[PDB]
């Protein structure tokens, strides 16, 4: 039911010059992966929003989840 542009997921993978041909199944997997990712990042960040007694989730909520989870370590110079 959910969705995300497959074409766009591809366009993004193909930013890399080393990445030349891509199977059909791949974006399809990524659609769902990104969906789980975006889902479980937000979920984590919101804790930090409630912790602080806000009702708006904000940039810095996010950074505060990234710093508190090893699996997300790869975004470090993404969000300083």
């Amino acid at each position: 039911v959910q969705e995300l542009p497959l074409a766009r997921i591809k366009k993004i993978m193909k930013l890399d010059e080393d990445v030349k041909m891509i199977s059909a199944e791949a974006p399809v997997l990524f659609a769902k992966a990104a969906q789980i990712f975006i889902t479980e990042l937000t979920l984590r960040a919101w804790i930090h929003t409630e912790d602080n007694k806000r009702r708006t989730l904000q940039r810095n909520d996010i950074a505060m989840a990234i710093t508190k989870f090893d699996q997300f370590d790869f975004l470090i110079d993404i969000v300083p």
Binding site: K32, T56, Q58, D61
Partner: protein
């Protein structure tokens, strides 16, 4: 390079974000913009491992196994089954 060429649509991102939270809740623009950047990094991140392992096996096309393997390699091993599962209800 345009924004539309390198990020997922913001409204698609917000939609999902908004699902993850109290229905009453709110989200900063800068917050959405941010996850949007992340998700794009996440896409690129798995790929470069997959591209490494995929060219390392003397192939030219990044496929299913490639991703999943890359995910195990980088600690997303938890995502692995639910994808596989979701990978059996859309293909033939």
């Amino acid at each position: 390079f345009r924004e539309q060429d390198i990020y997922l649509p913001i409204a698609n991102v917000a939609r999902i974000m908004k699902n993850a939270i109290p229905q009453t809740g709110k989200i900063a623009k800068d917050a959405k913009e941010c996850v949007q950047e992340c998700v794009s990094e996440f896409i690129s991140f798995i790929t470069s491992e997959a591209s490494e392992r995929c060219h390392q096996e003397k192939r030219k096309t990044i496929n299913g196994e490639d991703i999943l393997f890359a995910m195990s390699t980088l600690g997303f091993d938890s995502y692995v089954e639910p994808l596989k599962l979701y990978l059996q209800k859309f293909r033939e």
